[PDB]
Design a binder for this molecule. Structure first.
Ligand SMILES: CCCCCCCCCCCCCC
Ligand SMILES: CCCCCCCCCCCCCC
Ligand SMILES: CCCCCCCCCCCCCC
Ligand SMILES: CCCCCCCCCCCCCC
Lengths: 51, 51
């Protein structure tokens, strides 16, 4: 019983972390506002739809 | 008298236009926010102090 409970708990925790961090989709264009980049810049990903 | 007056008027008008448009100094770094430039970009001039 403990093993099954821990399996379920880990699954739920990983799902929640993924939802909080990334979500469940990816966009083609990303906006970056981190140094040393001046102001904001546009970056492009690879294979967003397939991922 | 008319010639002198028009000379003075032209001088004053040109000074006012210059003040309104540029001012009386130039900076080394300029910020550009015009299409097709994405977001804002930084540009650098030539010989600002001498000018
Ligand atoms: C089962 C794995 C548990 C991992 C816990 C670590 C939490 C990750 C950090 C939470 C976000 C922090 C944002 C500053
Ligand atoms: C069992 C439920 C499966 C449906 C999950 C749908 C998640 C939302 C996906 C939205 C994608 C939007 C693409 C632009
Ligand atoms: C003696 C020369 C007179 C020139 C008059 C032209 C004025 C220039 C335009 C004024 C600024 C317009 C901002 C939209
Ligand atoms: C007869 C008056 C002459 C003085 C004109 C000064 C104009 C202001 C210039 C400011 C330059 C600042 C450099 C950073």
């Amino acid at each position: 019983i403990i093993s099954i409970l821990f399996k379920s708990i880990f699954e739920v925790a990983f799902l929640l972390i993924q939802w909080y961090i990334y979500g469940f989709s990816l966009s083609a264009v990303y906006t970056c506002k981190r140094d040393p980049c001046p102001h904001q810049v546009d970056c492009f990903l690879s294979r967003p739809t397939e991922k």
